CSV table of C-alpha atoms and ligand atoms in Angstrom, one decimal:
chain,number,residue,atom,x,y,z
A,1,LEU,CA,0.0,0.0,0.0
A,2,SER,CA,1.3,3.4,-1.0
A,3,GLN,CA,2.1,6.2,1.4
A,4,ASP,CA,-0.5,8.5,-0.1
A,5,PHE,CA,-3.2,5.8,0.3
A,6,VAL,CA,-2.3,5.3,4.0
A,7,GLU,CA,-2.5,9.0,4.6
A,8,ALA,CA,-5.9,9.1,2.9
A,9,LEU,CA,-7.1,6.4,5.2
A,10,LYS,CA,-5.9,8.3,8.3
A,11,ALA,CA,-7.7,11.4,7.0
A,12,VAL,CA,-11.0,9.5,7.3
A,13,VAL,CA,-10.7,7.6,10.6
A,14,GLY,CA,-7.8,9.4,12.5
A,15,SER,CA,-4.2,8.4,12.8
A,16,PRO,CA,-4.6,6.1,15.9
A,17,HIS,CA,-7.2,4.0,13.9
A,18,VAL,CA,-4.9,3.0,11.0
A,19,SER,CA,-2.1,0.5,11.3
A,20,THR,CA,0.4,-1.0,8.9
A,21,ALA,CA,2.5,-2.6,11.6
A,22,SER,CA,3.3,-6.3,10.9
A,23,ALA,CA,2.2,-7.6,14.3
A,24,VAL,CA,-1.2,-5.8,14.2
A,25,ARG,CA,-1.7,-7.1,10.6
A,26,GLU,CA,-0.8,-10.7,11.6
A,27,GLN,CA,-3.4,-10.6,14.4
A,28,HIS,CA,-6.0,-9.7,11.8
A,29,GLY,CA,-4.9,-12.2,9.1
A,30,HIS,CA,-6.4,-15.4,10.6
A,31,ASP,CA,-9.4,-16.6,12.5
A,32,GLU,CA,-9.9,-19.6,14.8
A,33,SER,CA,-9.5,-22.1,11.9
A,34,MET,CA,-6.4,-23.9,10.6
A,35,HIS,CA,-6.3,-21.7,7.5
A,36,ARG,CA,-2.9,-20.2,7.2
A,37,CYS,CA,-2.5,-16.6,8.3
A,38,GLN,CA,-2.5,-14.2,5.4
A,39,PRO,CA,-2.1,-10.7,6.8
A,40,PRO,CA,-3.8,-7.7,5.3
A,41,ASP,CA,-1.7,-4.7,4.2
A,42,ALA,CA,-3.4,-2.5,6.7
A,43,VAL,CA,-6.0,-2.6,9.5
A,44,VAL,CA,-8.5,0.3,9.9
A,45,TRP,CA,-11.0,0.9,12.8
A,46,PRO,CA,-13.8,3.2,11.5
A,47,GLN,CA,-15.6,5.1,14.3
A,48,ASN,CA,-19.0,5.6,12.7
A,49,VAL,CA,-20.9,4.6,9.6
A,50,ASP,CA,-19.9,7.7,7.6
A,51,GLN,CA,-16.3,6.6,8.1
A,52,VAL,CA,-17.1,3.0,7.0
A,53,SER,CA,-18.6,4.5,3.8
A,54,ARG,CA,-15.6,6.7,3.1
A,55,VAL,CA,-13.1,3.9,3.8
A,56,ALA,CA,-14.9,1.6,1.5
A,57,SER,CA,-15.2,4.1,-1.3
A,58,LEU,CA,-11.5,4.9,-1.0
A,59,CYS,CA,-10.5,1.2,-1.2
A,60,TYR,CA,-13.0,0.4,-3.9
A,61,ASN,CA,-12.0,3.2,-6.3
A,62,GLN,CA,-8.3,2.5,-5.8
A,63,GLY,CA,-8.6,-1.2,-6.5
A,64,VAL,CA,-7.7,-2.3,-2.9
A,65,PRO,CA,-9.5,-5.3,-1.5
A,66,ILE,CA,-11.7,-4.9,1.6
A,67,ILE,CA,-11.9,-7.6,4.4
A,68,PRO,CA,-14.6,-7.0,7.0
A,69,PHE,CA,-13.5,-8.1,10.5
A,70,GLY,CA,-15.7,-8.7,13.5
A,71,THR,CA,-14.4,-10.7,16.4
A,72,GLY,CA,-12.3,-13.1,14.3
A,73,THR,CA,-14.0,-16.2,15.7
A,74,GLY,CA,-14.9,-17.6,12.3
A,75,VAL,CA,-13.7,-21.0,11.4
A,76,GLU,CA,-13.5,-21.0,7.6
A,77,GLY,CA,-10.8,-18.4,6.9
A,78,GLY,CA,-13.3,-15.6,6.1
A,79,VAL,CA,-10.9,-12.9,7.4
A,80,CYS,CA,-7.7,-14.3,5.7
A,81,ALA,CA,-6.5,-11.6,3.3
A,82,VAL,CA,-5.7,-13.9,0.4
A,83,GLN,CA,-5.2,-10.9,-1.9
A,84,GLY,CA,-3.9,-8.4,0.7
A,85,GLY,CA,-5.8,-5.2,1.1
A,86,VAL,CA,-7.4,-3.3,4.0
A,87,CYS,CA,-8.9,-5.2,7.0
A,88,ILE,CA,-11.8,-3.1,8.4
A,89,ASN,CA,-12.2,-3.9,12.1
A,90,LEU,CA,-15.7,-2.8,13.0
A,91,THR,CA,-15.7,-3.3,16.7
A,92,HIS,CA,-15.3,0.3,17.9
A,93,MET,CA,-19.0,0.8,16.8
A,94,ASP,CA,-20.3,-0.9,19.9
A,95,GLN,CA,-23.6,0.8,20.8
A,96,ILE,CA,-27.1,-0.8,21.3
A,97,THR,CA,-29.9,1.4,20.1
A,98,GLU,CA,-33.6,1.5,19.5
A,99,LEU,CA,-34.5,-1.1,22.1
A,100,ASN,CA,-38.2,-1.6,21.5
A,101,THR,CA,-39.2,-4.1,24.2
A,102,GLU,CA,-42.9,-3.8,23.3
A,103,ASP,CA,-42.1,-4.8,19.7
A,104,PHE,CA,-39.5,-7.4,20.6
A,105,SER,CA,-36.7,-5.8,18.6
A,106,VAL,CA,-33.4,-4.1,19.1
A,107,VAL,CA,-30.7,-2.5,16.9
A,108,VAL,CA,-27.0,-3.4,17.5
A,109,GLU,CA,-23.6,-2.2,16.0
A,110,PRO,CA,-20.8,-4.6,15.1
A,111,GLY,CA,-18.9,-4.3,18.4
A,112,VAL,CA,-21.9,-5.6,20.4
A,113,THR,CA,-21.5,-9.3,21.3
A,114,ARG,CA,-24.4,-11.6,22.3
A,115,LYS,CA,-23.2,-11.5,25.9
A,116,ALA,CA,-23.2,-7.7,25.9
A,117,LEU,CA,-26.7,-7.6,24.5
A,118,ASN,CA,-28.1,-10.1,27.0
A,119,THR,CA,-26.4,-8.3,29.8
A,120,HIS,CA,-28.1,-5.1,28.6
A,121,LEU,CA,-31.4,-7.0,28.5
A,122,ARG,CA,-31.3,-8.3,32.1
A,123,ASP,CA,-34.4,-7.1,34.0
A,124,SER,CA,-36.3,-6.7,30.7
A,125,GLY,CA,-37.8,-10.2,30.5
A,126,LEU,CA,-36.4,-10.5,27.0
A,127,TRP,CA,-33.4,-12.2,25.6
A,128,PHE,CA,-31.6,-12.9,22.2
A,129,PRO,CA,-31.4,-16.7,21.7
A,130,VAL,CA,-29.0,-17.4,18.9
A,131,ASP,CA,-25.9,-18.7,20.8
A,132,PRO,CA,-22.7,-19.7,19.0
A,133,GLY,CA,-20.1,-21.0,21.4
A,134,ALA,CA,-17.8,-18.0,21.0
A,135,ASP,CA,-18.7,-14.5,22.1
A,136,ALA,CA,-18.9,-13.2,18.6
A,137,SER,CA,-20.0,-10.0,17.1
A,138,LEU,CA,-23.8,-10.1,16.4
A,139,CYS,CA,-23.2,-8.4,13.0
A,140,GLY,CA,-20.5,-11.0,12.3
A,141,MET,CA,-23.1,-13.7,13.2
A,142,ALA,CA,-25.5,-12.1,10.7
A,143,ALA,CA,-22.7,-12.1,8.1
A,144,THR,CA,-22.0,-15.8,8.5
A,145,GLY,CA,-25.7,-16.9,9.0
A,146,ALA,CA,-24.8,-18.4,12.4
A,147,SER,CA,-27.0,-20.6,14.5
A,148,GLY,CA,-26.4,-22.2,18.0
A,149,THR,CA,-27.8,-24.6,20.5
A,150,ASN,CA,-31.0,-22.6,20.9
A,151,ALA,CA,-31.8,-22.6,17.2
A,152,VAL,CA,-33.8,-25.9,17.2
A,153,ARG,CA,-36.5,-23.9,19.0
A,154,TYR,CA,-35.9,-20.2,18.5
A,155,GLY,CA,-34.4,-20.1,15.0
A,156,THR,CA,-31.1,-19.2,13.4
A,157,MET,CA,-29.8,-15.7,12.5
A,158,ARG,CA,-31.8,-16.0,9.3
A,159,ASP,CA,-34.9,-16.4,11.4
A,160,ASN,CA,-34.1,-13.6,13.8
A,161,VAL,CA,-32.6,-10.8,11.6
A,162,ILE,CA,-35.3,-8.3,10.8
A,163,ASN,CA,-33.2,-5.6,9.0
A,164,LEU,CA,-29.6,-4.8,8.2
A,165,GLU,CA,-27.7,-1.6,7.6
A,166,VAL,CA,-25.1,-2.4,5.0
A,167,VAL,CA,-22.3,-0.3,3.5
A,168,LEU,CA,-22.1,-1.5,-0.1
A,169,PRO,CA,-18.6,-2.0,-1.6
A,170,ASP,CA,-18.6,1.4,-3.3
A,171,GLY,CA,-19.7,3.1,0.0
A,172,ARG,CA,-23.5,3.5,-0.6
A,173,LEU,CA,-25.6,3.0,2.5
A,174,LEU,CA,-28.4,0.4,2.2
A,175,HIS,CA,-31.1,-0.4,4.8
A,176,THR,CA,-32.2,-3.8,3.5
A,177,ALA,CA,-35.8,-3.5,4.7
A,178,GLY,CA,-35.8,0.3,4.8
A,179,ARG,CA,-34.4,2.8,7.3
A,180,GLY,CA,-35.7,2.2,10.8
A,181,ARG,CA,-38.3,-0.4,9.9
A,182,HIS,CA,-39.1,-3.4,12.0
A,183,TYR,CA,-42.1,-5.8,11.6
A,184,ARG,CA,-43.1,-9.4,11.7
A,185,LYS,CA,-43.6,-10.1,8.0
A,186,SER,CA,-43.5,-8.3,4.6
A,187,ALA,CA,-44.1,-9.1,0.9
A,188,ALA,CA,-42.8,-5.6,-0.1
A,189,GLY,CA,-40.5,-6.1,-3.1
A,190,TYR,CA,-37.6,-8.6,-3.0
A,191,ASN,CA,-36.4,-9.6,0.4
A,192,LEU,CA,-32.9,-8.0,0.5
A,193,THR,CA,-32.3,-8.8,4.2
A,194,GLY,CA,-32.0,-12.5,3.5
A,195,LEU,CA,-29.5,-12.0,0.7
A,196,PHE,CA,-27.0,-10.3,3.1
A,197,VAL,CA,-27.5,-12.8,5.9
A,198,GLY,CA,-24.9,-15.4,5.2
A,199,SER,CA,-22.9,-13.3,2.7
A,200,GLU,CA,-19.7,-13.5,4.8
A,201,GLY,CA,-18.5,-10.0,3.9
A,202,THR,CA,-18.5,-10.6,0.1
A,203,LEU,CA,-21.5,-8.3,-0.7
A,204,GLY,CA,-21.0,-5.4,1.7
A,205,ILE,CA,-20.2,-4.4,5.3
A,206,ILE,CA,-23.0,-4.9,7.9
A,207,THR,CA,-22.9,-1.8,10.2
A,208,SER,CA,-26.0,-2.5,12.2
A,209,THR,CA,-28.4,-5.4,12.7
A,210,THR,CA,-32.0,-5.2,13.8
A,211,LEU,CA,-32.7,-8.4,15.9
A,212,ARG,CA,-35.8,-10.2,16.9
A,213,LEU,CA,-36.0,-10.6,20.7
A,214,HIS,CA,-37.9,-13.4,22.6
A,215,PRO,CA,-39.6,-13.6,26.0
A,216,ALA,CA,-37.5,-15.4,28.6
A,217,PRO,CA,-38.9,-18.8,29.4
A,218,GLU,CA,-41.2,-19.2,32.4
A,219,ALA,CA,-39.1,-22.1,33.8
A,220,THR,CA,-36.0,-24.0,32.6
A,221,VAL,CA,-34.8,-27.5,33.1
A,222,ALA,CA,-31.5,-28.9,31.8
A,223,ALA,CA,-30.2,-32.4,31.9
A,224,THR,CA,-27.7,-34.8,30.4
A,225,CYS,CA,-28.4,-38.3,29.2
A,226,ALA,CA,-25.8,-41.0,28.5
A,227,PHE,CA,-26.3,-43.6,25.8
A,228,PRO,CA,-24.7,-47.0,25.0
A,229,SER,CA,-23.9,-46.0,21.4
A,230,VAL,CA,-24.0,-43.2,18.8
A,231,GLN,CA,-26.8,-45.0,17.1
A,232,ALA,CA,-28.9,-45.0,20.2
A,233,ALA,CA,-28.3,-41.3,20.9
A,234,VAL,CA,-29.1,-40.1,17.3
A,235,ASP,CA,-32.1,-42.4,17.0
A,236,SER,CA,-33.5,-40.8,20.2
A,237,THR,CA,-32.9,-37.4,18.7
A,238,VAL,CA,-34.7,-38.2,15.5
A,239,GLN,CA,-37.6,-39.8,17.5
A,240,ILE,CA,-37.8,-36.7,19.8
A,241,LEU,CA,-38.1,-34.4,16.7
A,242,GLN,CA,-40.6,-36.7,15.1
A,243,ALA,CA,-42.7,-36.7,18.3
A,244,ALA,CA,-42.8,-32.9,18.0
A,245,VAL,CA,-41.4,-32.3,21.5
A,246,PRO,CA,-40.5,-28.6,21.5
A,247,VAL,CA,-37.1,-29.1,23.1
A,248,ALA,CA,-35.2,-25.9,23.7
A,249,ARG,CA,-31.7,-27.4,23.2
A,250,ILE,CA,-30.6,-30.8,22.1
A,251,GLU,CA,-26.9,-31.2,21.7
A,252,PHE,CA,-24.9,-34.3,20.9
A,253,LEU,CA,-21.4,-35.2,22.1
A,254,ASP,CA,-19.6,-38.4,21.2
A,255,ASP,CA,-17.5,-40.2,23.9
A,256,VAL,CA,-14.3,-38.5,22.6
A,257,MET,CA,-15.9,-35.1,22.9
A,258,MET,CA,-17.5,-35.9,26.3
A,259,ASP,CA,-14.1,-36.9,27.7
A,260,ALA,CA,-12.4,-33.8,26.2
A,261,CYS,CA,-15.0,-31.5,27.8
A,262,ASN,CA,-14.7,-33.3,31.1
A,263,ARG,CA,-11.0,-32.7,31.0
A,264,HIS,CA,-11.3,-29.0,29.9
A,265,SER,CA,-14.2,-27.8,32.1
A,266,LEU,CA,-17.5,-31.7,34.4
A,267,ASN,CA,-17.6,-35.4,35.4
A,268,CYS,CA,-20.3,-36.8,33.1
A,269,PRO,CA,-20.0,-40.6,32.2
A,270,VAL,CA,-17.7,-40.9,29.2
A,271,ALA,CA,-20.3,-42.0,26.6
A,272,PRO,CA,-22.2,-40.6,23.6
A,273,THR,CA,-24.4,-38.0,25.4
A,274,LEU,CA,-27.2,-35.6,24.8
A,275,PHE,CA,-27.3,-32.3,26.6
A,276,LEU,CA,-31.0,-31.3,26.8
A,277,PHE,CA,-36.6,-27.6,28.2
A,278,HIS,CA,-38.6,-24.4,28.4
A,279,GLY,CA,-42.2,-23.8,29.6
A,280,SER,CA,-44.3,-23.7,32.7
A,281,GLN,CA,-43.9,-26.1,35.6
A,282,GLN,CA,-46.6,-28.3,34.1
A,283,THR,CA,-45.5,-27.9,30.5
A,284,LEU,CA,-42.1,-29.1,31.5
A,285,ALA,CA,-43.4,-32.3,33.2
A,286,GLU,CA,-45.2,-33.3,30.0
A,287,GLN,CA,-42.2,-32.6,27.8
A,288,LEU,CA,-40.0,-34.5,30.2
A,289,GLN,CA,-42.3,-37.4,30.4
A,290,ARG,CA,-42.5,-37.8,26.6
A,291,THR,CA,-38.7,-37.2,26.2
A,292,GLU,CA,-37.7,-39.6,28.9
A,293,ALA,CA,-39.9,-42.3,27.4
A,294,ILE,CA,-38.2,-42.0,24.0
A,295,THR,CA,-34.6,-41.9,25.4
A,296,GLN,CA,-35.3,-44.9,27.7
A,297,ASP,CA,-36.4,-47.1,24.8
A,298,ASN,CA,-33.0,-46.4,23.1
A,299,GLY,CA,-31.0,-47.2,26.3
A,300,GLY,CA,-30.6,-43.7,27.7
A,301,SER,CA,-29.7,-43.2,31.3
A,302,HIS,CA,-32.1,-41.6,33.7
A,303,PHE,CA,-31.7,-37.8,33.2
A,304,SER,CA,-28.8,-36.3,35.1
A,305,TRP,CA,-30.3,-33.0,36.1
A,306,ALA,CA,-28.9,-21.8,38.6
A,307,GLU,CA,-25.2,-22.5,38.5
A,308,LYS,CA,-24.7,-26.0,37.2
A,309,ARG,CA,-26.8,-25.3,34.2
A,310,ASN,CA,-24.5,-22.4,33.3
A,311,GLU,CA,-21.5,-24.6,33.8
A,312,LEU,CA,-23.0,-27.3,31.6
A,313,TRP,CA,-23.7,-25.0,28.7
A,314,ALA,CA,-20.4,-23.2,29.1
A,315,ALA,CA,-18.6,-26.5,28.6
A,316,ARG,CA,-20.6,-27.2,25.4
A,317,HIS,CA,-19.8,-23.7,24.1
A,318,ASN,CA,-16.1,-24.3,24.7
A,319,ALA,CA,-16.1,-27.7,23.0
A,320,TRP,CA,-13.9,-26.3,20.2
A,321,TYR,CA,-11.1,-25.5,22.7
A,322,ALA,CA,-11.7,-28.8,24.6
A,323,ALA,CA,-11.0,-30.6,21.4
A,324,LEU,CA,-7.8,-28.5,20.7
A,325,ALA,CA,-6.6,-29.3,24.3
A,326,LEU,CA,-6.5,-33.0,23.3
A,327,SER,CA,-3.3,-32.3,21.3
A,328,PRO,CA,-1.6,-29.0,22.5
A,329,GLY,CA,-0.1,-27.0,19.7
A,330,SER,CA,-2.5,-28.4,17.1
A,331,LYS,CA,-5.1,-26.4,15.1
A,332,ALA,CA,-8.6,-27.5,14.1
A,333,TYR,CA,-10.7,-27.9,11.1
A,334,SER,CA,-14.4,-28.6,11.4
A,335,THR,CA,-17.0,-30.1,9.2
A,336,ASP,CA,-20.5,-28.7,9.4
A,337,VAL,CA,-22.9,-30.8,7.3
A,338,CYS,CA,-26.7,-30.6,7.7
A,339,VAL,CA,-28.9,-33.5,6.4
A,340,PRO,CA,-32.6,-34.4,6.3
A,341,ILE,CA,-33.1,-35.5,9.9
A,342,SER,CA,-34.1,-39.1,9.0
A,343,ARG,CA,-30.7,-39.5,7.4
A,344,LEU,CA,-28.8,-38.2,10.4
A,345,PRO,CA,-28.3,-41.7,12.0
A,346,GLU,CA,-26.6,-43.1,8.9
A,347,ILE,CA,-24.2,-40.3,8.4
A,348,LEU,CA,-23.3,-39.7,12.1
A,349,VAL,CA,-22.6,-43.4,12.7
A,350,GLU,CA,-20.7,-43.6,9.5
A,351,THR,CA,-18.6,-40.6,10.5
A,352,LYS,CA,-17.9,-42.2,13.9
A,353,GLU,CA,-16.8,-45.4,12.2
A,354,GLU,CA,-14.6,-43.4,9.7
A,355,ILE,CA,-12.9,-41.4,12.5
A,356,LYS,CA,-12.2,-44.6,14.4
A,357,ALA,CA,-10.8,-46.4,11.3
A,358,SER,CA,-8.6,-43.4,10.6
A,359,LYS,CA,-5.3,-42.1,12.1
A,360,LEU,CA,-6.9,-38.7,12.8
A,361,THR,CA,-8.1,-37.3,16.1
A,362,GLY,CA,-11.7,-36.3,15.7
A,363,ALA,CA,-14.4,-35.3,18.2
A,364,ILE,CA,-18.0,-35.1,17.3
A,365,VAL,CA,-20.4,-32.4,18.7
A,366,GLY,CA,-23.5,-31.0,17.1
A,367,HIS,CA,-26.8,-29.2,16.8
A,368,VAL,CA,-28.5,-32.6,16.0
A,369,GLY,CA,-31.9,-31.1,16.5
A,370,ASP,CA,-31.3,-29.4,13.2
A,371,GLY,CA,-29.9,-32.4,11.5
A,372,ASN,CA,-26.5,-30.8,11.9
A,373,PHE,CA,-23.2,-31.8,13.5
A,374,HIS,CA,-19.5,-30.9,13.6
A,375,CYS,CA,-16.6,-33.3,13.2
A,376,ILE,CA,-13.7,-31.3,14.7
A,377,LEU,CA,-10.4,-32.6,13.2
A,378,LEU,CA,-7.1,-31.8,14.8
A,379,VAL,CA,-4.0,-30.9,12.6
A,380,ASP,CA,-0.3,-30.5,13.4
A,381,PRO,CA,0.4,-27.1,11.9
A,382,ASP,CA,3.7,-28.5,10.4
A,383,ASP,CA,2.6,-32.0,9.4
A,384,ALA,CA,1.7,-31.4,5.7
A,385,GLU,CA,0.6,-35.0,5.2
A,386,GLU,CA,-1.8,-35.0,8.1
A,387,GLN,CA,-3.2,-31.7,6.7
A,388,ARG,CA,-3.9,-33.4,3.4
A,389,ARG,CA,-5.7,-36.2,5.2
A,390,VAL,CA,-8.0,-34.0,7.2
A,391,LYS,CA,-8.9,-32.1,4.1
A,392,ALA,CA,-9.6,-35.3,2.3
A,393,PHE,CA,-11.7,-36.5,5.3
A,394,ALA,CA,-13.7,-33.3,5.5
A,395,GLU,CA,-14.3,-33.3,1.7
A,396,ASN,CA,-15.5,-37.0,1.8
A,397,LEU,CA,-17.9,-36.3,4.6
A,398,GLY,CA,-19.3,-33.2,2.8
A,399,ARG,CA,-19.9,-35.2,-0.3
A,400,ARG,CA,-21.7,-37.9,1.6
A,401,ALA,CA,-24.0,-35.2,3.1
A,402,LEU,CA,-24.6,-33.9,-0.4
A,403,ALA,CA,-25.4,-37.4,-1.6
A,404,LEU,CA,-28.1,-37.6,1.1
A,405,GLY,CA,-29.8,-34.4,-0.1
A,406,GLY,CA,-28.2,-32.2,2.6
A,407,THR,CA,-25.9,-29.1,2.7
A,408,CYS,CA,-22.2,-28.9,3.2
A,409,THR,CA,-22.5,-26.2,5.9
A,410,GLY,CA,-25.4,-25.7,8.3
A,411,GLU,CA,-24.0,-22.6,10.0
A,412,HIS,CA,-20.2,-22.0,9.8
A,413,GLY,CA,-20.2,-20.9,6.1
A,414,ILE,CA,-18.0,-21.5,3.1
A,415,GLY,CA,-15.1,-19.1,3.5
A,416,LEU,CA,-11.9,-20.7,2.0
A,417,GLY,CA,-12.6,-24.3,2.8
A,418,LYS,CA,-15.9,-25.3,1.2
A,419,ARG,CA,-15.8,-23.5,-2.2
A,420,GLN,CA,-15.7,-26.7,-4.3
A,421,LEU,CA,-18.4,-28.4,-2.2
A,422,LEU,CA,-20.7,-25.3,-2.8
A,423,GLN,CA,-20.3,-25.7,-6.5
A,424,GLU,CA,-21.4,-29.4,-6.3
A,425,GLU,CA,-24.2,-28.4,-3.9
A,426,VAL,CA,-26.0,-25.9,-6.1
A,427,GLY,CA,-24.8,-26.8,-9.6
A,428,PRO,CA,-23.8,-24.6,-12.6
A,429,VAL,CA,-27.0,-22.4,-12.7
A,430,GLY,CA,-26.9,-21.9,-8.9
A,431,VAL,CA,-23.2,-20.9,-9.1
A,432,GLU,CA,-23.7,-18.5,-12.0
A,433,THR,CA,-26.8,-16.9,-10.3
A,434,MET,CA,-24.9,-16.4,-7.0
A,435,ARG,CA,-22.0,-14.9,-9.0
A,436,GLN,CA,-24.3,-12.5,-10.9
A,437,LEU,CA,-25.5,-11.2,-7.6
A,438,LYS,CA,-22.0,-10.8,-6.3
A,439,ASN,CA,-21.1,-9.0,-9.5
A,440,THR,CA,-23.9,-6.4,-9.4
A,441,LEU,CA,-23.1,-5.5,-5.8
A,442,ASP,CA,-19.2,-5.7,-6.1
A,443,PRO,CA,-18.4,-5.2,-9.8
A,444,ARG,CA,-14.6,-4.9,-9.2
A,445,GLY,CA,-14.5,-8.1,-7.0
A,446,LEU,CA,-12.8,-6.2,-4.1
A,447,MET,CA,-15.3,-7.2,-1.3
A,448,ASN,CA,-13.5,-10.0,0.5
A,449,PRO,CA,-12.1,-11.7,-2.6
A,450,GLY,CA,-11.4,-15.4,-2.8
A,451,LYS,CA,-14.2,-16.4,-0.4
A,452,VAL,CA,-17.5,-18.3,-1.0
A,453,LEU,CA,-17.4,-18.2,-4.8
B,501,FAD,C1,-15.4,-21.9,20.1
B,501,FAD,C2,-16.2,-21.5,18.9
B,501,FAD,C3,-17.6,-21.9,18.8
B,501,FAD,C4,-18.4,-21.6,17.7
B,501,FAD,N1,-19.7,-22.0,17.7
B,501,FAD,C5,-20.4,-21.7,16.7
B,501,FAD,C6,-21.8,-22.1,16.6
B,501,FAD,O1,-22.4,-22.8,17.5
B,501,FAD,N2,-22.5,-21.7,15.5
B,501,FAD,C7,-22.0,-20.9,14.5
B,501,FAD,O2,-22.8,-20.6,13.6
B,501,FAD,N3,-20.7,-20.5,14.5
B,501,FAD,C8,-20.0,-20.9,15.6
B,501,FAD,N4,-18.6,-20.4,15.6
B,501,FAD,C9,-18.1,-19.7,14.5
B,501,FAD,C10,-18.1,-18.2,14.7
B,501,FAD,O3,-18.2,-17.9,16.0
B,501,FAD,C11,-19.3,-17.6,13.9
B,501,FAD,O4,-19.2,-18.0,12.5
B,501,FAD,C12,-19.5,-16.1,14.1
B,501,FAD,O5,-20.7,-15.7,13.4
B,501,FAD,C13,-18.3,-15.3,13.5
B,501,FAD,O6,-18.4,-13.9,13.9
B,501,FAD,P1,-17.1,-13.0,14.0
B,501,FAD,O7,-17.5,-11.6,14.0
B,501,FAD,O8,-16.2,-13.5,15.0
B,501,FAD,O9,-16.5,-13.3,12.5
B,501,FAD,P2,-15.1,-13.0,11.8
B,501,FAD,O10,-14.2,-14.2,11.8
B,501,FAD,O11,-14.6,-11.7,12.2
B,501,FAD,O12,-15.7,-12.9,10.3
B,501,FAD,C14,-16.4,-14.1,9.7
B,501,FAD,C15,-16.8,-13.7,8.3
B,501,FAD,O13,-17.8,-12.7,8.3
B,501,FAD,C16,-17.3,-11.5,7.7
B,501,FAD,N5,-17.8,-10.4,8.5
B,501,FAD,C17,-17.6,-10.2,9.9
B,501,FAD,N6,-18.2,-9.2,10.3
B,501,FAD,C18,-18.8,-8.6,9.2
B,501,FAD,C19,-19.6,-7.5,9.1
B,501,FAD,N7,-20.0,-6.6,10.1
B,501,FAD,N8,-20.1,-7.2,7.8
B,501,FAD,C20,-19.8,-8.1,6.9
B,501,FAD,N9,-19.1,-9.2,6.9
B,501,FAD,C21,-18.6,-9.4,8.1
B,501,FAD,C22,-15.8,-11.6,7.6
B,501,FAD,O14,-15.3,-10.9,6.5
B,501,FAD,C23,-15.6,-13.1,7.5
B,501,FAD,O15,-15.7,-13.6,6.1
B,501,FAD,C24,-17.8,-20.8,16.7
B,501,FAD,C25,-16.5,-20.4,16.8
B,501,FAD,C26,-15.7,-20.7,17.9
B,501,FAD,C27,-14.3,-20.3,17.9
């Protein structure tokens, strides 16, 4: 990057908010995945949306790539600057606005994390349910199309994003559903909000998100349930969903994951396990009765039932790091397939068998209520042959999911790792259509290049 360009950036955001230092760039050249660090040429922290617009227009017209950066917790290399350019760290815009408790909505800027929002909402009787394990930027979660353990009942980001404020690549400001609007449903024109959810920073920069809030549940019960086999755990899950029990969370851990989480955080029996209800005192008893009946018929243990619940779900949210702690110094790559629920037993049991018959260390954890799971595969950062084997494993598993009518990623996204799988998933006309949308919004191809498509 030229000296005149760097001075132009500083003129927009202020000297302290532009850095070309190698260490600062290296910290912004990678996320939590195994993808190799590729540092941007500069990092910029805009202080308001006018500055985001002016930074984007400066980069765009000079032919400099733009990489939006939230909290850097992605796992597909979305923030790696494969073509250099300017990394725009958005987290100094960190204000919550327009809290409308009577309408169940709130507007947040990119520096707001889910934990910050729910802290702000204490005493309101409302909460925001979409809960990825990491304390990520909510706007970053909109950009990746994230979900979480609560999504089986309360929906994903796609279900809970009502509106987005987006700086387009050339700096124009778009409010996808209209400035200041919030409502339950609309048929007005084409739905632009859904286009930018899951766009991973390749179509523009999300500078605020309007979120749907939910009422806090009247009563909560959490429990764990140990099974004799992966088959028995996943059959129970499928049967619970087919019985229409409105479980609030239903998370699967294989025995490897359960032992890893025990060691990193618990003392649950080392076995394929379900972490599991919201409603009134009496509603819970019915849900529990129907769910315990199904789990018992598949060999589940009696359920192992305001501090131990928090510790239970904190251990699940840290499963990624529990897995990494199995082999210190290693990095991780995760699969993320989502299949029609009736096919979940076959593919989960097959994955377990394939991990066991392999030399790789893999732990399985997942949002199985959605038909979704992660195979977290560990890699030695220097063992290039192990790295080729994890990639081959992840690609085989993704193709098996596609063969079953599913998708190669339920929530993490495509980034750098799944671009060939996406082409297989949607086919030539799907790829061309996505590319035409990318081209009309980002003609010069400068909005996070090398990702998704
Ligand atoms: C321990 C752990 C657990 C996780 N659990 C889950 C889980 O349960 N579910 C799940 O879905 N994910 C999960 N993730 C992945 C990650 O937390 C999510 O993908 C999250 O949405 C990433 O947000 P971020 O701001 O940290 O993203 P970053 O890594 O900063 O960016 C991710 C991508 O989005 C783009 N981007 C970021 N912010 C914006 C913006 N404001 N506008 C436009 N583009 C933007 C970036 O360019 C990049 O391509 C987990 C990650 C970790 C480390």
